């Protein structure tokens, strides 16, 4: 029996003030560096344990011993994502129902049907960059978010956000981002009941109403038109859970749409942003990825099959997910009393946090060059030990969107590498801005067209 370490405390507030910082994930990584593979973390009314080693996390990923927990972040997101798939407990009827209904909509096979709509947006991104003047640069996260948001709007409910036509965000996105911002602020409040936050709370209630009203209208409009487009909304309106034989109701459909819009916004564009960052910081890797793009993408527009042949691009994306996974943690609870790692006894209901970026730096798994960007680490998933790489979560509660995210990311990065040479013209210094996701803030490049037509 080992006593786990714990970072510095602040009297009655326990460890909570350590989260009152601009970059809490990066702060928690630094604590893990200092304290090792497990540390206790306490706040008023809260005890959890942060795990960072594959040795312990492989046990935590045992679904017979641990189930998904809603972290405080997820509990707060649930105020607007409801019992959508990402904020529901495994035992809620709507989790298994929606899971069973949506699985075929998200399979590798379903990507063949989304492919054309993803290409539509990817070409818009390429045309924007083809149309820049010589003296201009690219705001990378900003453009990647235009791409990923538009892609989930079109594939998700046949709706064009038309993000490449505008600077101001869509009304829905204004409220979604402000809601997510309130969540992060609320996690950092030492005195969350202070009347100083009454306005924040009033604003949050307003932003929830905007998200609900706008998505409910999307659903109502679709029902009234009878249109049967090949999108997630159509699948949810028509699908029946094989098990219960029931369809999802409209309220839960709205929560799923809200869930997908969160996931497909900065969470997914973060992957592309970090990938392009690592590529321009590693020119030999960029060249190898660019050589593959040119070899495989022989037609004016990529086909579904060509995207699947972009193996090295897929390895680039996995290595980007290894260093900066854009859902940086998830939470579990013990289903019964159990012992973690032969050393840490846990009681039924005890909570764990999996600190993914720190797992992905476990030198006993990856070797001493863990900070280097080497996509070749992913040549053979069979050489990687169990549960060493978890950017999409675990088990039946893993990311249902994983194939969607990787297909759109591989497609557009492939096209970017085919059509442009890239210059890190400012010698950009990585600055990772934290929301509930991660972004290389202010990352900019210049792109010189290879003048290959579409
Ligand atoms: C690179 C982009 C993405 C990453 C890194 C990511 C990561 C994750 C992770 C780690 C989880 C587990 C969370 C937990 O255990 O609390 C998760 C769950 C989920 N993700 Fe993603 N995701 C991405 C993109 C997407 C997209 C594009 C969609 C949908 C369009 C999506 C939909 C979901 C859903 C619905 C769940 C909940 C699944 C369930 O519990 O049944 N994700 N994601
Ligand atoms: O460590 C984290 C990282 C954030 C996890 C959410 C990530 N994500 C984003 C979208 N979907 C999930 N979050 C803990 C913080 C905490 C610990 C103890 C006491 C208070 C807060 C939590 O949210 O509970």
Curated annotation (Swiss-Prot):
Outcome (variant: residue 392 to W): Large decrease in the heme reduction potential in the presence and absence of substrate arachidonate. 10% reduction in efficiency to couple NADPH consumption to substrate monooxygenation
Subcellular location: Cytoplasm
Biotechnological utility: This protein is a target of protein engineering. Its selectivity-directing and activity-enhancing mutations have been extensively studied and the designed mutations allow this enzyme to act on non-native substrates and/or in order to enhance production of synthetically desirable end-products.
Effect of residue 263 to C: No effective fatty acid oxidation. No effect on electron transport from NADPH to FMN
Keywords: Cytoplasm, Electron transport, FAD, Flavoprotein, FMN, Heme, Iron, Metal-binding, Monooxygenase, Multifunctional enzyme, NADP, Oxidoreductase, Transport
Residues of the site described as Important for catalytic activity: 267
Outcome after substituting residue 81 to F: 800-fold binding affinity for laurate as substrate. High coupling of NADPH consumption to laurate formation. Very much more effective in indole hydroxylation. Favors omega-2 hydroxylation
Outcome of swapping residue 81 to I: No effect in binding affinity for laurate as substrate. High coupling of NADPH consumption to laurate formation. No indole hydroxylation. Favors omega-2 hydroxylation
Effect of residue 187 to Q: Higher activity in the hydroxylation of highly branched fatty acids
Induction or repression: By pentobarbital. Expression is negatively regulated by repressor bm3R1 at the transcriptional level.
Presence of the UniProt keyword NAD in the record: no
UniProt binding sites for heme: 399
Keyword Magnesium annotated: no
Binding-site residues, (9Z)-hexadecenoate: 50
GO molecular-function terms, A-Z: aromatase activity; flavin adenine dinucleotide binding; FMN binding; heme binding; identical protein binding; iron ion binding; NADPH-hemoprotein reductase activity; oxidoreductase activity, acting on paired donors, with incorporation or reduction of molecular oxygen, reduced flavin or flavoprotein as one donor, and incorporation of one atom of oxygen
Any Gene Ontology CC annotation: cytosol
Region (Cytochrome P450): 1-454
Similarity comment text for this entry: In the N-terminal section; belongs to the cytochrome P450 family.
Free-text function comment from the UniProt entry: Functions as a fatty acid monooxygenase. Catalyzes hydroxylation of fatty acids at omega-1, omega-2 and omega-3 positions. Shows activity toward medium and long-chain fatty acids, with optimum chain lengths of 12, 14 and 16 carbons (lauric, myristic, and palmitic acids). Able to metabolize some of these primary metabolites to secondary and tertiary products. Marginal activity towards short chain lengths of 8-10 carbons. Hydroxylates highly branched fatty acids, which play an essential role in membrane fluidity regulation.
Protein name, per record: Bifunctional cytochrome P450/NADPH--P450 reductase
Source species of the chain: Priestia megaterium (strain ATCC 14581 / DSM 32 / CCUG 1817 / JCM 2506 / NBRC 15308 / NCIMB 9376 / NCTC 10342 / NRRL B-14308 / VKM B-512 / Ford 19) (Bacillus megaterium)
